[PDB]
């Protein structure tokens, strides 16, 4: 369908622009090239030059300071004479290829193992599994099945996950929304 | 001592070793018969049997050394000890975040904090020998982990008791995290020690993992240290911290540890600054004695940690000294202050529990006065020793205040408060700057003559150098105020001429810092002849700066020659890689980077107008912008969140932007030489080439941002709320002096003369003016949010948010300086016995006043409806502060 | 230090034996003095 | 004469090396002061 997949592309692009769907830098550049392929048709190297448009409509504010739009214009060379519907199909497929799609994601601050340092991380919850995602590389660091996790506890500032004897050590984070996280965990009553 | 258990374990090693000699005993005597008879058929049968008894003992003895495994079994028991204590931290984090664990009402908090403090101290004393005994002795590895792992099991048991009865929920969970951080740091220390095993055959990549675990444990030292004693300093508990004085004493009783790598003159300079810091800290507690005794908690705990820094710095002082009689004379003087401060802390801790008591306050007065005379003896022996640049430390601390005195004067003309005082003109005071400069070259000439010699001529030339610039800076203020507030730009170039001279003078004494009575063949002592030659070109620029102002045809021509001369002094050390101590935000660098776009509009239009006064207005704006920009290009570069590959990109773009602007500064000199408009059009073309480097400096600042946001908060919102918030705080500070009764009590009143009434009317005239000055400042920013001069767009919000952050700071720093002056005026009536404290409190309250007036006049005018009320009341602050300054020179002299 | 003399005395098991097969008495006698010195460092290491 | 004197002068530096390890590890500053002139008088005896 060229209409419903286009609406899903618009939804995924908006979730990219507000940042609810985490993506890596190269995937953000490829999605910005796909967005320029949608908004301006096929790519012409004479048309796209330096200082063409601002990246606030194509990237969030944590990606406009990367100085990579020419790389996105290099991604324009990866676009070429691609049509609009094929760009939508590749956008939806590359969105569904990453594990961040459809997964409840929360930006948290954790303590390093051994080092007394605060590091931002991402927590991704599904109906059956939770995952830890790196801030820079957007890589799934570790996965945890729902059946293996024993208990969970929240606070107005922090959150922790008790795994029992299946995993050595608990999982401690500083969450301002861990109460809704525990509410979603309790919503997974389907065993 | 020998153990029979390991003796029985080592006994099968001697079984194969002694029977090896038994197989070798019968071997050679059978080989002795083979020397006589070469061919015997039973001889070769028993000779192979002799060698088989050797080789069977070979294979058993070789594998016994690998089956020994020294220190391997005992570290595995430490793993289960760490796995047990981490599971204790797991369920305690579960219960305390749910508040379900019942505490123990029998046990106490401060009793548990005394146990946990002493536990880490015995741990930390073992860690530094553990790294050396790791690589050296493999049997010591299993020996030390038996000691270490047994400590954490009651330490976690002591941690869960105090955290259960801990009231504060952020504090009840933060103690669990650092103990978890301490456990995993020892766990990775267990991983590095077991994998290496103390093998010198093993490569140094494991040794770097060991030294990483050293700093991992050292991280666990200070995290567990500062969290607990400050929690004990929250109460009036004096225990452990008083023992830390003794724990600093017993290391001094250990004696000289070894030969220091640093020089004797290097550690002497570190001692005199730390000894100056503790003397004003306890004198601050005299002010907080009767007024606010609850603040005295972490003050002595700061003095507790600083005395450990004092004992550690004084530890290699005796060996580095040439005479052991002088070096042993130092170390007992430290314990003399250690005995006095130990009585100072435990009397204040009971006074923390008993705030209404006044006899312990008087008892705290004399022992504070005793250690003040005792700290004079710890430096008089340093004065007796010719080694150490003791005068140069007092020189650099003094001229930094003269720089801070000039910091008030450079903000006098930019705010416009430096009006013409009487009939003073530039012709009246031009010679007093130069007659002081005539002796200044002779003081500069004898500095390289006193490079090798006694300490008496060195300290005399050092003290006369401070007496020269203080005589010079006073007549600088006479000449700067002589120009008048109508032409403020020539006042800025007059003070900044001698300000960069003072910065060159401060670097001049630093050449004699490393060269005290030493030879001159070193290039740093040639830099003593070179930076003075730079100062020779600066003191003759000071001759030329007087020649610059007195005429108008070469007014901005001769001023820009000293401007480009100052930048090359800065750019020489800017290209040199120097990590600064201060950490600056990149958003402050963005404010200085975007300011060049407004500075290029000032620089080109001044040369197009061909007015020498506008060139000085450019050269004052160009030097002020280019000074802090290269500082923001260096301080923000060495931030840990900034990536180290992108900082040299900004350092390359920041260097060529200054190189592109110095060429622009060289071409506007040609605009002053040639009035042709064709040279003026090139200034428009050169402005974008600097702006091309500005845009690359912007994009280098975009890729260096370690913070998640480009701005922390909204700029206009928090600047407005902190404006009116500090407006009532000065009014709260104004009623504090009226709340303070005159000291009728003879105990608290150290001085009860009539100049305290002169201080109190000067402090009330400070308080009454600053109450109306902050309401003139309240109407100032309210006009800035009504007329809209600073802007509200998000693109310029990075250019104004640093100003909006400074508008919060300088209003609160005025609110802090009016609090510290009221803290000084509280100590003034009761008698503080400190002349320089009342001088510094009255100078910083004028320094913050001109700082807020500068922060108000940024993107604003000088003749607004509220700025003229800021001008009249701001002049009322300075005339009340300077009257308090001259009264402070006689206060407690 | 054990692995030094393990290959020296392991060769000396064949070194002093093969010279006695050939009757090379100066070659056998010097091989004993090297093997005795190798046993000196062997015993001093094993005692330590 | 000359070969044996090099063995003696080698061991005098071992005594100077031993006094430096002694004086850095001595609790008593009086014997540490004697340890300074110990290796000094070794050099005063050997170099003469």
UniProtKB/Swiss-Prot annotation, chain A:
It comes from Homo sapiens. This is Talin-1. Residues 1-191 form the FERM domain. It is found in: Cell projection, Ruffle membrane; Cytoplasm, Cytoskeleton; Cell surface; Cell junction, Focal adhesion. Residues 73-191 are annotated as: Interaction with LAYN. The lineage of its organism: Eukaryota, Metazoa, Chordata, Craniata, Vertebrata. The chain holds residues 208 to 398 of 2541 of the full protein. The gene is TLN1. Consists of an N-terminal FERM domain linked via a short unstructured region to a large flexible C-terminal rod which contains 13 amphipathic helical bundles (R1-R13). The rod begins with a five-helix bundle (R1) followed by three four-helix bundles (R2-R4). These are followed by a series of eight five-helix bundles (R5-R7 and R9-R13) in which the N- and C-termini are positioned at opposite ends of the bundle, creating a linear chain. The four-helix bundle R8 does not disrupt the chain because it is inserted into a loop in the R7 five-helix bundle. Part of a complex composed of THSD1, PTK2/FAK1, TLN1 and VCL. Interacts with THSD1; this promotes interaction with PTK2/FAK1 and VCL. Binds with high affinity to VCL and with low affinity to integrins. Interacts with APBB1IP; this inhibits VCL binding. Interacts with PTK2/FAK1. Interacts with PIP5K1C and NRAP. Interacts with LAYN. Interacts with SYNM. Interacts with ITGB1; the interaction is prevented by competitive binding of ITGB1BP1. Interacts with SVEP1. High molecular weight cytoskeletal protein concentrated at regions of cell-matrix and cell-cell contacts. Involved in connections of major cytoskeletal structures to the plasma membrane. With KANK1 co-organize the assembly of cortical microtubule stabilizing complexes (CMSCs) positioned to control microtubule-actin crosstalk at focal adhesions (FAs) rims.
Curated annotation (Swiss-Prot), chain C:
This is Talin-1. Part of a complex composed of THSD1, PTK2/FAK1, TLN1 and VCL. Interacts with THSD1; this promotes interaction with PTK2/FAK1 and VCL. Binds with high affinity to VCL and with low affinity to integrins. Interacts with APBB1IP; this inhibits VCL binding. Interacts with PTK2/FAK1. Interacts with PIP5K1C and NRAP. Interacts with LAYN. Interacts with SYNM. Interacts with ITGB1; the interaction is prevented by competitive binding of ITGB1BP1. Interacts with SVEP1. Consists of an N-terminal FERM domain linked via a short unstructured region to a large flexible C-terminal rod which contains 13 amphipathic helical bundles (R1-R13). The rod begins with a five-helix bundle (R1) followed by three four-helix bundles (R2-R4). These are followed by a series of eight five-helix bundles (R5-R7 and R9-R13) in which the N- and C-termini are positioned at opposite ends of the bundle, creating a linear chain. The four-helix bundle R8 does not disrupt the chain because it is inserted into a loop in the R7 five-helix bundle. It is found in: Cell projection, Ruffle membrane; Cytoplasm, Cytoskeleton; Cell surface; Cell junction, Focal adhesion. It comes from Homo sapiens. The chain holds residues 1395 to 1442 of 2541 of the full protein. Signal peptide: none annotated. High molecular weight cytoskeletal protein concentrated at regions of cell-matrix and cell-cell contacts. Involved in connections of major cytoskeletal structures to the plasma membrane. With KANK1 co-organize the assembly of cortical microtubule stabilizing complexes (CMSCs) positioned to control microtubule-actin crosstalk at focal adhesions (FAs) rims.
């Amino acid at each position: 369908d060229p209409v419903q997949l286009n609406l899903l592309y618009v939804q995924a692009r908006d979730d990219i622009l507000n940042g609810s769907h985490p993506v890596s830098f190269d995937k953000a550049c490829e999605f910005a090239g796909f967005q320029c392929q949608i908004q301006f048709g096929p790519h012409n190297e004479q048309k796209h030059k330096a200082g063409f448009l601002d990246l606030k409509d194509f990237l969030p504010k944590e990606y406009v300071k990367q100085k990579g739009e020419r790389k996105i214009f290099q991604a324009h060379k990866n676009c070429g004479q691609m049509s609009e519907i094929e760009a939508k199909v590749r956008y939806v497929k590359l969105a569904r290829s990453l594990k961040t799609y459809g997964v409840s994601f929360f930006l948290v601050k954790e303590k390093m193992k051994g080092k007394n340092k605060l590091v931002p991380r991402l927590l991704g919850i599904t109906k059956e599994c939770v995952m830890r995602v790196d801030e820079k590389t957007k890589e799934v660091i570790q996965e945890w099945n729902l059946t293996n996790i024993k208990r969970w506890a929240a606070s107005p500032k922090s959150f922790t996950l008790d795994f029992g004897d299946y995993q050595d050590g608990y999982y401690s984070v500083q969450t301002t929304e861990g109460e809704q996280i525990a509410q979603l965990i309790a919503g997974y009553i389907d065993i | 001592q020998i153990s029979p258990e390991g003796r029985a374990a080592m006994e099968p090693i001697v079984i194969s070793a002694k029977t090896m000699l038994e197989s070798a005993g019968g071997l050679i005597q059978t080989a002795r018969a083979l020397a006589v008879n070469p061919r015997d058929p039973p001889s070769w049968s028993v000779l192979a049997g002799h060698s088989r008894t050797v080789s069977d003992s070979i294979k058993k003895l070789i594998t016994s050394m690998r089956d020994k495994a020294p220190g391997q079994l005992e570290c595995e028991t430490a793993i289960a000890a760490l796995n047990s204590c981490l599971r204790d931290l797991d369920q305690a984090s579960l219960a305390a975040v749910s508040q379900q664990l019942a505490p123990r009402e029998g046990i106490s908090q401060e009793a548990l904090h005394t146990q946990m403090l002493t536990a880490v101290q015995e741990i930390s004393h073992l860690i530094e020998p553990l790294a050396n005994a790791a690589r050296a002795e493999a049997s010591q590895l299993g020996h030390k982990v038996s000691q270490m792992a047994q400590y954490f099991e009651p330490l976690t048991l002591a941690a869960v008791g105090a955290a259960s009865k801990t009231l504060s929920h952020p504090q009840q969970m933060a103690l669990l995290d650092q103990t978890k951080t301490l456990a995993e740091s020892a766990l990775q220390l267990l991983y590095t020690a077991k994998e290496a095993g103390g093998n010198p055959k093993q490569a140094a990549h494991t040794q770097e993992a060991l030294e990483e675990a050293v700093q991992m444990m050292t991280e666990a030292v200070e995290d567990l240290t500062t969290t607990l004693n400050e929690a004990a300093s929250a109460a009036g508990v004096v225990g452990g911290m008083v023992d830390s004085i003794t724990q600093a004493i017993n290391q001094l009783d250990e004696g000289p540890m070894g030969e220091p790598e640093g020089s004797f003159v290097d550690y002497q300079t570190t001692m005199v600054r730390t000894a100056k810091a503790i003397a004003v800290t306890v004198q601050e507690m005299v002010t907080k004695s009767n007024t606010s005794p609850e603040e005295l908690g972490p003050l002595a705990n700061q003095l507790t940690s600083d005395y450990g820094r004092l004992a550690s710095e004084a530890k290699p002082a005796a060996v580095a000294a040439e005479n052991e009689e002088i070096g042993s004379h130092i170390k007992h003087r430290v314990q003399e202050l250690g005995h006095g401060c130990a009585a100072l802390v435990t009397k204040a801790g009971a006074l923390q529990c008993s705030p209404s008591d006044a006899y312990t306050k008087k008892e705290l007065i004399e022992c504070a006065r005793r250690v003040s005379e005792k700290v004079s003896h710890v430096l008089a022996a340093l004065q007796a020793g010719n080694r150490g640049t003791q005068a140069c430390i007092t020189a650099a601390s003094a001229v930094s205040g003269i720089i801070a005195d000039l910091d008030t004067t450079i903000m006098f003309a930019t705010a416009g408060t430096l009006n013409r005082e009487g009939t003073e003109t530039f012709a009246d005071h031009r010679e007093g700057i130069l007659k002081t400069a005539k002796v200044l070259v002779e003081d500069t000439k004898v500095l390289v003559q006193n490079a090798a010699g006694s300490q008496e001529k060195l300290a005399q030339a050092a003290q006369s150098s401070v007496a020269t610039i203080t005589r010079l800076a006073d007549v600088v203020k006479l000449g700067a105020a002589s120009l008048g507030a109508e032409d403020p730009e020539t006042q800025v170039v007059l003070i900044n001429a001698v300000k960069d001279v003072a910065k060159a003078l401060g670097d001049l004494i630093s050449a004699t810092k490393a060269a005290a009575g030493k030879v001159g063949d070193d290039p740093a002592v040639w830099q003593l002849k070179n930076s003075a030659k730079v100062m020779v070109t600066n003191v003759t620029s000071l001759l030329k700066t007087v020649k610059a102002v007195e005429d108008e045809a070469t007014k901005g021509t001769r001023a820009l020659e000293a401007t480009t001369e100052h930048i090359r002094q800065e750019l020489a050390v800017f290209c040199s890689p120097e990590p600064p101590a201060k950490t600056s935000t990149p958003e402050d660098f963005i404010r200085m980077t975007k300011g060049i776009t407004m500075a290029t509009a000032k620089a080109v239009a001044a040369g197009n107008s061909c007015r020498q006064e506008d060139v000085i207005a450019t050269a004052n704006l160009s030097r002020r912008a280019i000074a802090d920009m290269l500082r923001a290009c260096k301080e923000a570069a060495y931030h840990p969140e900034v990536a180290p590959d992108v900082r040299l990109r900004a350092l390359h773009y920041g260097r060529e932007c200054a190189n592109g602007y110095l060429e622009l500064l060289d071409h506007v000199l040609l605009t002053l030489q040639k009035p042709s408009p064709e040279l003026k059009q090139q200034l428009t073309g050169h402005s974008k080439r600097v702006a091309g480097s500005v845009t690359e400096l912007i994009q280098a600042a975009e890729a260096m941002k370690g913070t998640e946001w480009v701005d922390p908060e909204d700029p206009t919102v928090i600047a407005e709320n902190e404006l009116l918030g500090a407006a009532a705080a000065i009014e709260a500070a104004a009623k504090k002096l009226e709340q303070l009764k005159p000291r009728a009590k003879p105990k608290e009143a150290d001085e009860s003369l009539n100049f305290e009434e002169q201080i109190l009317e000067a402090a009330k005239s400070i308080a009454a003016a600053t109450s109306a000055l902050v309401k003139a400042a309240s109407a100032a920013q309210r006009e800035l949010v009504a007329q809209g001069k600073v802007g509200a767009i998000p693109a310029n919000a990075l250019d104004d948010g640093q100003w909006s952050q400074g508008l919060i700071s300088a209003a609160r720093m005025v609110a802090a300086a009016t609090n510290n002056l009221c803290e000084a005026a509280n100590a003034a009536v009761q008698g503080h016995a400190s002349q320089e404290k009342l001088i510094s409190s009255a100078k910083q309250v004028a320094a913050s006043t001109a700082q807020l007036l500068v922060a108000c006049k940024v993107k604003a005018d000088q003749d607004s409806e509220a700025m003229k009320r800021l001008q009249a009341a701001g002049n009322a602050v300075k005339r009340a502060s300077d009257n308090l300054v001259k009264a402070a020179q006689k206060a407690a002299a | 230090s054990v692995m030094e003399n393990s290959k020296v005395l392991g060769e000396a098991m064949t070194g002093i034996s093969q010279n006695a097969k050939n009757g090379n008495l100066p070659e056998f006698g010097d091989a004993i003095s090297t093997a005795s010195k190798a046993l000196c460092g062997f015993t001093e290491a094993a005692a330590q | 004469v000359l070969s044996a004197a090099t063995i003696v002068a080698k061991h005098t530096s071992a005594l100077c090396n031993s006094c430096r390890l002694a004086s850095a590890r001595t609790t008593n500053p009086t014997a540490k002061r004697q340890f300074v002139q110990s290796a000094k008088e070794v050099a005063n005896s050997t170099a003469n």
